[PDB]
From Swiss-Prot:
It is found in: Cell projection, Cilium, Photoreceptor outer segment; Photoreceptor inner segment; Endosome; Nucleus. Changing residue 91 to K: Does not affect affinity of RD3 for GUCY2D. Monomer. Interacts with GUCY2D; negatively regulates its activity. The interaction with GUCY2D promotes the exit of GUCY2D from the endoplasmic reticulum and its trafficking to the photoreceptor outer segments. Interacts with GUCY2F. The interaction with GUCY2F negatively regulates GUCY2F activity. The interaction with GUCY2F promotes the exit of GUCY2F from the endoplasmic reticulum and its trafficking to the photoreceptor outer segments. Interacts with GUK1; up-regulates GUK1 activity. Keywords: Cell projection, Coiled coil, Cytoplasm, Endosome, Leber congenital amaurosis, Nucleus, Sensory transduction, Vision. Changing residue 15 to K: Reduced the affinity of RD3 for GUCY2D. It comes from Homo sapiens. It is linked to Leber congenital amaurosis 12: A severe dystrophy of the retina, typically becoming evident in the first years of life. Visual function is usually poor and often accompanied by nystagmus, sluggish or near-absent pupillary responses, photophobia, high hyperopia and keratoconus. The gene is RD3. One of its GO terms (biological process) is retina development in camera-type eye. Changing residue 40 to V: In an individual with cone-rod degeneration; abolishes protein expression; less effective in suppressing GUCY2D activity by GCAPA. This is Protein RD3. Residues 6-35 form a coiled coil. GO terms for cellular component: cone photoreceptor outer segment; cytoplasm; endosome; nucleus; perinuclear region of cytoplasm; photoreceptor inner segment; photoreceptor outer segment; rod photoreceptor outer segment. Changing residue 18 to R: Does not affect ability to suppress GUCY2D activity induced by GCAPA. Its main location: other.
Length: 143
């Protein structure tokens, strides 16, 4: 049994991945549509205009992971839907995927985070992380 936060992680890191990969294909098709491509061609960083690079490095992972865990379980759903329909509105692109992914995530984070802190602080007299321990701990199996 994994934590709800992990489920969110998978959901966002999965959407990001499928769209990152799909976006890479789209850009390739774009290049082949214009042709001129001999053997291969730079994505957008070797000789084109980079500025931002698509790379989910350890820190990038952590940034986003920290964001995902700060996301409400059921709020992930809309967040996902929004990302998909937004990306589709702007068309696939690995540069856009990454920038839009962090953009929306940070946007939704700023709002939702404020709600978290505001609600927990005001209801600090009703704090309760766990309910009770039960037989499930005796039969939780091993991973």
């Amino acid at each position: 049994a994994r934590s709800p936060a992990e489920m969110v992680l998978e959901t966002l890191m999965m959407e990001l991945t499928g769209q990152m990969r799909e976006a890479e294909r789209q850009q390739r098709e774009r290049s082949n549509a214009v042709r001129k491509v001999c053997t291969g061609v730079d994505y957008s960083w070797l000789a084109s205009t980079p500025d931002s690079t698509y790379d989910l490095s350890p820190i990038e992972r952590l940034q986003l992971e920290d964001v995902c865990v700060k996301i409400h379980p059921s709020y992930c759903g809309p967040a996902i839907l929004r990302f998909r329909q937004l990306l589709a509105e702007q068309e696939p692109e690995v540069q856009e995927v990454s920038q839009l992914f962090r953009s929306v995530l940070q946007e939704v984070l700023e709002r939702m985070k404020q709600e978290e802190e505001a609600h927990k602080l005001t209801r600090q007299w009703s704090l309760r992380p766990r309910g009770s321990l039960a037989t499930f701990e005796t039969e939780a199996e091993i991973d």
